[PDB]
Amino acid sequence: MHPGWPDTVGPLRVPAGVVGLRPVRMRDAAAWSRIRLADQHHLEPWEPMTGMDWKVRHAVTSWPSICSGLRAEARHGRMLPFVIELDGEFVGQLTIGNVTHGALRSAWIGYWVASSRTGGGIATAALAMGLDHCFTAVQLHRIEATVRPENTPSRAVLAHVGFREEGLLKRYLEVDGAWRDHLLVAITAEELPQSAAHRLVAAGRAEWC
Numbered sequence: 001m002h003p004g005w006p007d008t009v010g011p012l013r014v015p016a017g018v019v020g021l022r023p024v025r026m027r028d029a030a031a032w033s034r035i036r037l038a039d040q041h042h043l044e045p046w047e048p049m050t051g052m053d054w055k056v057r058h059a060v061t062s063w064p065s066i067c068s069g070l071r072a073e074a075r076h077g078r079m080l081p082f083v084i085e086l087d088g089e090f091v092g093q094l095t096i097g098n099v100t101h102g103a104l105r106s107a108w109i110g111y112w113v114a115s116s117r118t119g120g121g122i123a124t125a126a127l128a129m130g131l132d133h134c135f136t137a138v139q140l141h142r143i144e145a146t147v148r149p150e151n152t153p154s155r156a157v158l159a160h161v162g163f164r165e166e167g168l169l170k171r172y173l174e175v176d177g178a179w180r181d182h183l184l185v186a187i188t189a190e191e192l193p194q195s196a197a198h199r200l201v202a203a204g205r206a207e208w209c
Contacts, residue, residue, distance in 0.1 A: 019126055
């Protein structure tokens with residue numbers, strides 16, 4: 001029904017500190033709202049449009065409905081909504097979405113990290129451990145991601161873990177006021193002779209924790 005959920009993932013050490021993943025909770029309202037509100041300019045140009053005012057969407061009071069929705073999708077096996085912890089503290093999210101099994105066994109992956117904590121390897125470690133979790137506990141074959149060509153930091157994160165570019169989705173998603181092209185990148189389980197975490201440690205981007 002929902003292999004690999006709920007669960008915790010990690011940990012791995014990056015220059016910024018110790019990174020792990022764990023399920024979204026109701027108590028995350030305060031940190032999620034504080035960070036998302038403060039980081040509007042860092043986040044809005046890269047995330048799908050909600051048709052809502054950014055400050056009403058990210059009020060502390062909005063989280064219960066959002067968290068309940070995320071956990072309901074997770075109980076259905078369609079999503080794995082993780083929080084990224086840095087030294088045990090909420091600093092971002094890693095979401096595995098549109099999960100399918102059967103003959104497809106694929107999903108998309110997405111993430112964000114608080115701007116004040118960027119450039120310290122957090123998203124790269126979160127992606128690697130999330131990918132490893134998908135290819136083991138979630139029993140998936142393939143993980144994809146959609147990323148605007150202009151999103152140089154995110155393309156670097158995806159490149160660190162070994163994603164391949166597979167195509168260009170024209171006018172794919174409403175982002176920052178218009179339909180925007182997104183690159184489609186992907187990786188399959190049989191492309192990792194070692195885990196993605198092992199690859200990061202070998203490349204000097206993480207340490208075993």
